[PDB]
Amino acid sequence: MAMAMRSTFAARVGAKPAVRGARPASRMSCMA
DSSP states (O other): TTTHHHHHHHHHHGGGGGGTTTTOOOSSSOOO
């Protein structure tokens, strides 16, 4: 659902979330 895009965006503001946050599984769910 749109939550996937919300989350991808809310990561890509910083990028970090999706590389450093999602180092191991320490994120949530997302489009990417």
